[PDB]
Design a protein around this ligand. Sequence first.
Ligand SMILES: [Cl-]
Ligand SMILES: [Cl-]
Ligand SMILES: [Cl-]
Ligand SMILES: [Cl-]
Ligand SMILES: [Mg+2]
Ligand SMILES: [Zn+2]
Ligand SMILES: [Zn+2]
Ligand SMILES: [Zn+2]
Lengths: 417, 415, 415
Amino acid sequence: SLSINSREVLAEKVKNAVNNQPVTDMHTHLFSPNFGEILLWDIDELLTYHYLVAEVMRWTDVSIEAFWAMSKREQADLIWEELFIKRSPVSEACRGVLTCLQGLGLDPATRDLQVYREYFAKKTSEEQVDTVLQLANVSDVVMTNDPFDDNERISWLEGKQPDSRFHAALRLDPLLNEYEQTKHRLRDWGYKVNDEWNEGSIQEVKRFLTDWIERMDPVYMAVSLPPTFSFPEESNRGRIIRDCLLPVAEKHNIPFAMMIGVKKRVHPALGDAGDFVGKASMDGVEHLLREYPNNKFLVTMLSRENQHELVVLARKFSNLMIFGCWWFMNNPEIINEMTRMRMEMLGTSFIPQHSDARVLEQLIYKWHHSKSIIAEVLIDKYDDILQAGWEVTEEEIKRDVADLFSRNFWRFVGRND
Amino acid sequence: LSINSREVLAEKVKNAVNNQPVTDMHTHLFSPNFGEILLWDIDELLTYHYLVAEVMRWTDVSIEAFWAMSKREQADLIWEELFIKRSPVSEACRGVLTCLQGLGLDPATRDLQVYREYFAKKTSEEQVDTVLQLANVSDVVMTNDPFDDNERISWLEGKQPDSRFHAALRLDPLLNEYEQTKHRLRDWGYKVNDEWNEGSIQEVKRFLTDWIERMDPVYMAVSLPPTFSFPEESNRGRIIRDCLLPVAEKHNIPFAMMIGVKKRVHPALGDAGDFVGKASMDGVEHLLREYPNNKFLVTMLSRENQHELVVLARKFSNLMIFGCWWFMNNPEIINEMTRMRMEMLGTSFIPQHSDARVLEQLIYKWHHSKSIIAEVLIDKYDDILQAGWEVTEEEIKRDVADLFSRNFWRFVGRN
Amino acid sequence: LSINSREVLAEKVKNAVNNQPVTDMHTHLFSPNFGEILLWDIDELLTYHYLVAEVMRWTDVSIEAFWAMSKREQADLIWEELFIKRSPVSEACRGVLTCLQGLGLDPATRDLQVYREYFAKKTSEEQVDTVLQLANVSDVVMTNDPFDDNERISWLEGKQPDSRFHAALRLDPLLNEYEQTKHRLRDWGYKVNDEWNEGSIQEVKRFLTDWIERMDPVYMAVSLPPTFSFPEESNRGRIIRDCLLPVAEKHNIPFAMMIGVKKRVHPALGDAGDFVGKASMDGVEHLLREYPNNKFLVTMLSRENQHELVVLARKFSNLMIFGCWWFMNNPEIINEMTRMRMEMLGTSFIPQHSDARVLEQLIYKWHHSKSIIAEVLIDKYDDILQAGWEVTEEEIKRDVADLFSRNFWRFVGRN
Ligand SMILES: [Cl-]
Ligand SMILES: [Cl-]
Ligand SMILES: [Cl-]
Ligand SMILES: [Cl-]
Ligand SMILES: [Mg+2]
Ligand SMILES: [Zn+2]
Ligand SMILES: [Zn+2]
Ligand SMILES: [Zn+2]
């Protein structure tokens, strides 16, 4: 019955447990460094992250065309001047760049971007991965692997495997969302899908999935979906999910990850910075969970206004695992409210965060900023049960922290450690 | 003797809040003379449907296997899965520990066998006395359903509740399931016709008036789906327009509408199977505007309805909003709702009800809510103190009494 | 010295925020040379429509009897019902107290007759000087409606506002009520046709151009319902498309859209009878994308629009979002909005406007909002300070000037 005797010691012990727990980051856009140039890293890549492109375009008089015509260094220079020098870098994405520099032993105080660049010029990808995963305390990274991308598909077809720290996830947007165009690529690749949606088309699409499952050994198959997402639906998407994806997933015991609420290309000229958000109906997700009890679903949603009801839906269905605070949700005010709602209604039965890192060094700030918030939530929740006379031990806190940052994910996808 | 600093204010407000007897204006408890339908004890607390939903997120035991377990075994499984194997940090898990502690039991031991021994030595009457004392609740409003055969008999035998328990007439089967319920009405001698004519109208009114007579309810209540609309040419829309509203106005009894529940999305979970959806405000707005002589108590289930519900209260004095219902009854939501409510309505609302299904829940439902409501009050008083206003301890006691008891009785026009 | 802890940052930020002169970019105040339409004094504070809604939730006085009372009588009733019989803890009630205190009056006495004496002794001009000084407001943007006969007079008599007050051309009757308004245009010599054709288009453009010439407005404004959509084959859709946007582009004048107000759900309440609804973002999205040479100022009334409004501002630099309008202008909501906005937009937004209808409200609207905005800034500067950034006091002063004044003038392309 030795246990934690005060809130101040609780806070110390929780913060230490959270900081020390190696993270599984279950959705990123990073790649094993052996995949080469598609692994993005360094300060110029940090600064030209699309979140920062959106932000600089609210201030700068430089036209979008002129921006895209600049070199990466020039874009980074402009972003630095407009968002850090001419106004204080108070936004979450700008703060994050500074957290990264500090983590790396660079000094934000000098504002010396040329000195920062020198740091990265002297390293290999493999070295930077080692440094960054250590600093961010991340043991495992789940990638986003898109067989429709020519520059990724090559490494796979060349027999490359990621190192043991990097795990595959099969990204299926082009197949589910753009089948009218994508069906022709499948044909080019020997999958004899017909004009008509018949048994032959069903079989060849299942074979496409099975071949990539065999190749990648993905931990889940994923898709991003619009605010209008509905299921069942008479559409290529509704048919592919019903006839191909769900049966394959069940057979292979692979979860289906759905990232719902992104409205694509509302400002096309902005590229990756041009996507918007909408509230979705919960009906399709509800139907999927109820009607496919032998399938597992990972869900994150983009609208603030979906988050509470998504937690309630998790209370209804054990084949739903909700994860992370995605994109426009990934800001302190929202991370805090979401994490509290989730813990109040689900206890520790969810995955509080993922980084969605596109640039390697972002693991540093995405985990630092989120861990501090998650630690605050845990401190309050433990203190409340301490107040109720419960005895919490440091071993129990370590166990719960491991569940939230790692074990709940592996347990749900039916694998590792 | 003036209140001169936040620190002094905080102690005065917490004392006033703690000391104020509560009227709990919507519960699923029953006067103890109604028998076994009053649920109580640690096995009942642990097998509350909120905890059933939570344990099914973790356990390998199937739902079928779970329902086949005895109550004690279900309670044991829930204890192991939600308190021993993971820390009991959820609001519903924390609530069980609050009740245990309140009763003088020691959660440090985690000894469910010992806790059970406490309950085995007591009668229902003794436990009600204990619980209402510890929760500082003076008055409990029940949910009395004349369509439940069990509950019906008791009222038909002329059994009256204890004076601490007040009736409220539950109408879901009548309003939401008329096709099916009209056959029972006619078994009971209410000659409702196949068509909605004057005959039907008068006999439904007679059913309402008969039950008002028997129950002396403080309000009539219904829970409603996110799709709720009014006017509507449906059985619900016709009964409300033609029968419920006129009867309610004549007897000056409010109509309680609990809006936002989507029933049985996961049928096998039973009570743990219901979901939530955002509702349109249009139907509520229409009722308030078009029936100014009727009074309406509303609580809604969707987070995304709460702010606009507060605005609608600003518009209509015949609306009384109440409580943080079910999926809203979690600290992060209780806090945001109570602040939005106080900022736009001052003290003209009812901040909380327990919806207790198990007697001992009054202990944590009230404990956990009072701490949050006290903190909101402290901030709001502090803000007017900083503006130069002098608040007296007697004024705090008054406002606290309005929130926890008097606003309800004023609105219903009673006690 | 120089800033190396949260404690020091808090001192510097609070000083910067308190000292920064405010441009209040949307109010319902008027240059004092406009005469009686400039509302001021304690009785006007107390009878603000926010307080009429609140008193009606408590008083037994009927709405008809209320409107039959004199202003002083109305103000007496509201004081008794909202300040004396219950603690004045609501945001709007707290605001009255902050004004009294700011003017050097003592709320501790509750001496309404003494408070009244204060104002009886001053001219409009003196009180404008006092209030703008106390509130640290350098510039006030008015709402000027050429459809209002009284207002139209000062403009037609060539009266110009005092250099501290700026015009904004309010267009609601034209855009929202064209069928009724076309007759008045015709009367004024704007000879619109029955059919929406080139004839009608040119006469509506001429109306706008004439009023732009007369008023020199900083923006043209309209308030819109939750059902607002664009493009739309309606008089509103057509006037915006064919007249308003091209005229705005030619004069480089922004269009301010205040979206989400549902008018007169409770008619008898007058100004206090308006409600809220969530709107589609589709119309605003279309307008921003398809009219890149037009500038748009937007504020929305529903809590549930705020986050997605901030995301839309990330997408479009021709969108400036502003303020926490009306039902949003409460501490709980101001805080969450200001945080969401800063997290996603840095300093590239206008955190607040007063919408003051009564002169003295500038005091509380800015005092209450500045304290919240300062705390949000302290958190955000601290986060980058802890991350190793050197924040200077001059940078703080710059950022604060952008939020409270410069961002507005930069966007509108003026002062
Ligand atoms: Cl973005
Ligand atoms: Cl919503
Ligand atoms: Cl539940
Ligand atoms: Cl109002
Ligand atoms: Mg909040
Ligand atoms: Zn992603
Ligand atoms: Zn209930
Ligand atoms: Zn206004």
